[PDB]
Scaffold this active site. Structure first.
Site, short mmCIF file in Angstrom:
data_model
loop_
_atom_site.label_atom_id
_atom_site.label_comp_id
_atom_site.label_asym_id
_atom_site.label_seq_id
_atom_site.Cartn_x
_atom_site.Cartn_y
_atom_site.Cartn_z
N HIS A 1 -2.19 20.53 5.08
CA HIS A 1 -3.56 20.01 5.34
C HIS A 1 -3.59 18.48 5.49
O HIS A 1 -4.65 17.90 5.79
CB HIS A 1 -4.53 20.44 4.21
CG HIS A 1 -5.79 21.14 4.65
ND1 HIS A 1 -5.93 21.78 5.87
CD2 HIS A 1 -6.96 21.36 3.99
CE1 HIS A 1 -7.14 22.31 5.95
NE2 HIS A 1 -7.78 22.08 4.82
N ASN B 1 -13.02 18.30 2.13
CA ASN B 1 -14.32 18.85 2.48
C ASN B 1 -15.48 17.81 2.44
O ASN B 1 -16.65 18.17 2.71
CB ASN B 1 -14.64 20.05 1.56
CG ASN B 1 -13.67 21.23 1.71
OD1 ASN B 1 -12.70 21.18 2.46
ND2 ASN B 1 -13.95 22.30 0.98
N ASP C 1 -4.59 19.40 11.19
CA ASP C 1 -3.75 20.62 11.25
C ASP C 1 -4.50 21.76 11.91
O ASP C 1 -5.71 21.93 11.69
CB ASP C 1 -3.27 21.04 9.83
CG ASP C 1 -4.40 21.14 8.80
OD1 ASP C 1 -5.13 20.14 8.58
OD2 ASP C 1 -4.52 22.22 8.15
N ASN D 1 -12.56 23.06 7.17
CA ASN D 1 -13.72 22.50 6.46
C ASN D 1 -13.79 20.97 6.44
O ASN D 1 -14.85 20.41 6.15
CB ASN D 1 -13.78 23.05 5.03
CG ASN D 1 -14.28 24.49 4.99
OD1 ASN D 1 -15.15 24.88 5.77
ND2 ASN D 1 -13.70 25.30 4.11
#
EC number: 3.1.1.29
Length: 188
Positions: A20, A68, A93, A114
């Site tokens: 991520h 997020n 990603d 997100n």
């Protein structure tokens, strides 16, 4: 002209090697190639820098918001410098492309990501910004917060190097030429 390039991530040594953070891996490589190391700037809730690609200001950002909450950093920095969404490039990603591949995109959905979802929200329910999609393959929470095996990491590193070279090409010769090169990289 692109005025702001954002690399998505989570903060801390714990997440530095996880999938991520692939967007940040690309912005860090770009900053090194152009001799403009990132430094902490609490005003914009992340690490920042400024480069030149013949011959205007380009600003760089890696948020420390947690993934997020990424929109907090992108929103604050774009509003301060009066930068429009079609002047922003967000690297992230991408589950729907394999390790070794990367693509440019304008607009569209968040694809389950997100970090992208929060940026669309904080720019005013506006998805019309540019993206660099860095392939990581499919597995999910355990997957995107996991560390790739060595074979997969080498392929992601290859794609990030080609994407940095094609970003410089975008500034020199245009998005169409940059896209032609990047998208044919593994299609040969």
């Amino acid at each position: 002209a692109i005025k702001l390039i954002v690399g998505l991530a989570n903060p801390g040594a714990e997440y530095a090697a996880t999938r991520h953070n692939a967007g940040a891996w690309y912005v860090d490589l770009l900053a090194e190639r152009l001799r403009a190391p990132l430094r902490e700037e609490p005003k914009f809730f992340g690490y920042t820098s400024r480069i030149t690609l013949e011959g205007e200001d380009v600003r760089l950002l890696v948020p420390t918001t947690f993934m997020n909450l990424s929109g907090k950093a992108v929103g604050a920095m774009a509003s301060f410098y009066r930068i429009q969404p079609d002047e922003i490039l967000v690297a992230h990603d991408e589950l729907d492309l394999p390790p070794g591949v990367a693509k440019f995109k304008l607009g569209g959905g968040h694809g389950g990501h997100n970090g992208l979802k929060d940026i669309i929200s904080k720019l005013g329910n506006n998805p019309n910004f540019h993206r660099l999609r860095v392939g990581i393959g499919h597995p999910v929470v355990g997957f995107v917060l996991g560390k790739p095996p060595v074979s997969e990491q080498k392929l992601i590193d290859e794609a990030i190097d080609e994407a940095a070279r094609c970003t410089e090409l975008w500034f020199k010769e245009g998005l169409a030429k940059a896209t032609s090169r990047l998208h044919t990289f593994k299609a040969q």
